[PDB]
């Protein structure tokens, strides 16, 4: 067992929090650095994603495990803002340790943290900007991705991934009361091209290429067949003629199947110009039955996971045919440009220009598991982040303007409200001081002076207040002076900040109320 008292429990908890902050402090903002994760077997990840970092990192101190579990819960709710939580929690505990040593009982502190949480919801509702979802609002949607992707990329994939995510998102959410499902966007990875070769595929990519040297590479305006029955070879001879007949025997059952298929070929786009016929088979296809498909200018694939073709059932929209003896001319779907690209081993089939299946694939390219992990997470984070925009019309002026302007409301208006109490005013001050950790860390990670930038921010905030105008004041991490996120293009999420402030308040309240470290089960 273990027991620590005389408030040493509070001293230990602060030490753990200040450490976890120092781990993920430099991991914040577009000027931030990358963290390495070492598996010990040689697999290395270089990531800024706190959802990855907090999940995979070895945490030595037991107090820091509490913040990791809580932050991961926030990740599975809003889908972003992990390092926001760790930074907010850490400074809430440091600013409190100062007041704890001054004689403020921990309960007095945590009660004011709850009082301020109620006030933070008031500013959020007034600070939000409602946007339309019109198809000409790509200006705003592009700015959203230029905000969210910029954090997780190297600034050169910013221009690459910006239109890739933007178009992928609009393929899912119709401009109406529809829906949005991130399983409607496929995340594909491959090698042999550079990270900046990541591209948007209008449809679905099949990884398995066929085994035949004449497989047609360019197939335009073709119907698509999915077969679930083997077309391969499905016995005593004394001479060459009988041996051949035994081989033809089981392939003659295939032959009749092929006759009905080449009747399906002659029936469907057999005489139609600029059109053709694509066949995909869950099972095998005979190399001579592939010679037949090549003979009739047919694209063939075989030995494929039905789950990939299950998407093709949605993408091309045909009926899967369990028996070619029951082969019907109407079961086929529609497809446009079909391209089979060749890498060092397998060939990839691009099923594109599809009627209107509302399904898309983002093809992540790169050389090493280093960058493929970086982009894999970047795309999944970006698609989810932009989805929060189309799910919630409310967009928050970014650049810390939420975290900056709260310092004005918490300091000024609440003191005239007197809505708390004289001694709990200590906590109102602690919360306002700690909300500066987000704009402050963003500056520190840029190399600009952490105090002077905040001073320049405050000046514009005062000028707009004396001018009686609406001015959204942010931080320019390139020049060093202040900016306006609504002009520069930095946007943030309503739902993320709601769950960030309410979550961090609870995390810190739970940690500030820690009385005794009791070791149990031992």
């Amino acid at each position: 067992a273990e027991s620590l008292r005389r408030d040493a429990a509070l001293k230990v908890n602060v030490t753990s929090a200040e450490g976890l902050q120092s781990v993920l402090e430099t991991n914040l903002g577009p000027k931030g650095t990358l963290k390495m994760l070492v598996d010990g077997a040689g697999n290395i990840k270089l990531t800024k994603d706190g959802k990855v970092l907090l999940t995979e990192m070895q945490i030595q101190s037991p107090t820091a495990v509490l913040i990791a579990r809580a932050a991961a819960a926030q990740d599975e709710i809003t889908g972003d803002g992990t390092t926001t939580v760790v930074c907010l929690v850490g400074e809430l505990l440091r600013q409190a340790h100062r007041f704890i040593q001054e004689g403020v009982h921990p309960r007095i502190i945590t009660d004011g943290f709850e009082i301020a949480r109620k006030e933070s919801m008031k500013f959020l509702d007034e600070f939000k900007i409602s946007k339309t979802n019109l198809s000409n609002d790509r200006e705003f949607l592009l700015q959203v991705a230029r905000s969210s992707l910029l954090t997780k990329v190297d600034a050169d994939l910013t221009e690459v991934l910006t239109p890739i995510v933007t178009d992928a998102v609009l393929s899912v959410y119709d401009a109406q009361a529809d829906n949005l499902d991130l399983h409607m966007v496929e995340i594909m990875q491959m090698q042999h091209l550079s990270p900046k070769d990541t591209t948007f595929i209008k449809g679905l990519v099949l990884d398995h290429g066929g085994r035949h040297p004449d497989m047609p590479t360019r197939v335009k305006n073709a119907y698509v067949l999915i077969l679930n029955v083997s077309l391969e070879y499905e016995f005593f001879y004394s001479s060459a003629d009988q041996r051949d007949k035994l081989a033809a025997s089981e392939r003659k059952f295939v032959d009749a199947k092929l006759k009905k298929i080449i009747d399906l070929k002659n029936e469907v786009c057999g005489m139609d110009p600029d059109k053709g016929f694509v066949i995909i088979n869950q099972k095998g296809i005979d190399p001579m039955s592939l010679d037949v498909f090549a003979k009739h200018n047919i694209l063939a694939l075989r030995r494929a996971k039905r789950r990939n073709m299950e998407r093709l059932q949605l993408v091309t929209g045909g009926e899967a045919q369990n028996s070619v003896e029951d082969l019907s001319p109407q079961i086929l779907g529609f497809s446009g440009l079909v391209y089979q690209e060749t890498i060092g081993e397998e060939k990839f089939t691009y099923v594109t220009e599809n009627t209107d299946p509302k399904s898309c694939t983002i093809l992540i390219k790169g050389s090493t598991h280093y960058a493929l992990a970086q982009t894999k997470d970047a795309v999944r984070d970006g698609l989810r982040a932009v989805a929060n925009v189309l799910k919630d019309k409310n967009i928050i002026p970014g650049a810390g303007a939420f975290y900056i302007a709260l310092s004005r409301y918490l300091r000024s208006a609440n003191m005239n409200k007197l809505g708390a109490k004289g001694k709990t005013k200590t906590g109102i001050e602690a919360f306002a001081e700690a909300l500066l950790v987000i704009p402050k860390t963003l500056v520190k990670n840029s190399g600009f002076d952490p105090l002077d930038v905040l001073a320049m921010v405050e000046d514009e905030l005062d000028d707009a207040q004396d001018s009686d105008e609406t001015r959204y004041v942010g931080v320019d991490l390139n020049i060093g002076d202040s900016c306006d996120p609504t002009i520069e293009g930095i946007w943030d999420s309503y739902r993320v900040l709601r769950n960030a402030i309410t979550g961090a308040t609870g995390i810190a309240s739970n940690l500030l109320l820690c009385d005794e470290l009791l070791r149990a089960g031992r």
Partner: protein
Amino acid sequence: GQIIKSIAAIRELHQMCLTSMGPCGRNKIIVNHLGKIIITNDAATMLRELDIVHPAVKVLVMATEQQKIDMGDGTNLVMILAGELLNVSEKLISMGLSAVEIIQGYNMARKFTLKELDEMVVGEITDKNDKNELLKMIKPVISSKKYGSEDILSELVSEAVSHVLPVAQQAGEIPYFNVDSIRVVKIMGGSLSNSTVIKGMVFNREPEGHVKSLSEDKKHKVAVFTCPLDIANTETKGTQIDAMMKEIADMGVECIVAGAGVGELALHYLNRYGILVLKVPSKFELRRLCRVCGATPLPRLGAPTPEELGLVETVKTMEIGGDRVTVFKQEQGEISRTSTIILRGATQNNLDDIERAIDDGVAAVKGLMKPSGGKLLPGAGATEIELISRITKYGERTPGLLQLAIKQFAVAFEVVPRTLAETAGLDVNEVLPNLYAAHNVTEPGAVKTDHLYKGVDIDGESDEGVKDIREENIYDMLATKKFAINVATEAATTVLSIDQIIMAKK
């Protein structure tokens, strides 16, 4: 400082490559954990054998894998550029320039460097596939591997390359030259003048049949079988041998290859009647026989369908260096898709290492394909020294703290003309300042004439300063440089961004 500790780690592999690159380079003894002595100048072979310790090295090593797999040259250009790009960053770090500001600078220089490389183009290989145009590139590629042996290896490669580059015309969309198009074999004994090139496949295994030669006709037809040869077994179980060749020869076959075992009588009778018999342990090499002899393997037994026979000009058994080999080759027709490099050489390390060099020369020709690969750059640091001057000009044009990064960026490109000197044994306190002046002149014109051709003297011709690259026809591949700059710039950016190394949950 994690970045300081990373700098210490890269100093180890920097020392490895700093003395490696160049025709005057120094070899490394590499001891394989399985008991093999490997002595080579190839840093890719080095890093494949070098165990990786500091995770920052894993970045640099995987970077060289990107270079080596995707481009058949640039191995040391990645390690050498990367080593110094991170060395000079120590000054920027110590001057107080933050990691993100250093990163921003190198990315800004990435744009400046790529645009200038397009302007450094001197000549262009017009894709004549002529031995003379091939030698212009093959020679400098063979250089840095064996200094002064280019005469032997250039005649070996440029002639071997003409075997796998067939007569092609109006062909920019038809790809040629697979990496496996040229095979290299090792025969212990002899010297460089004992090496030669066979226009087709040579089996390192000694003649297995008793037949030396086929008929004298052109395009001797050939069969490959997949099933094991024995008395005809029925399609099912069974719980004629020589009749196979009675079927094969019907179309004009003098040579019978069996991709599987051989029955009792055929082992005698196939060879008794003067037909070559073959069974190949390498199954991909059977796919090579599909490409060399043109032979289509018969999937069935004893049934050589006419479409399952190929046409090969000449198949004989030959004696190489006293150790016998079997040759399945073409001869002025059905032109072979594979040519074999016969290396006779007494020292198994030099013999194998010569193959390692020729392997890279084969790979260079793969980059001499049509993908904008004809562009030539001025060699011997004429690219590097001119980049230094043009980069410093972009510094004058660039306001802000980015000026400090650009200045240190140019310093990094001095490691290549320096390495060319330290390995060659000319005083770096004299060669380097002479390089600066040779390329930094006031031209009465916007086109530097004879001042973009100034080189680095690795020869024993004693001269103050440096030589002209056109004397030996020393040109560098633009695509090799452009891709290398992209790899090293991003690779160094990666290392410069590592703030903390965290062990995963275990």
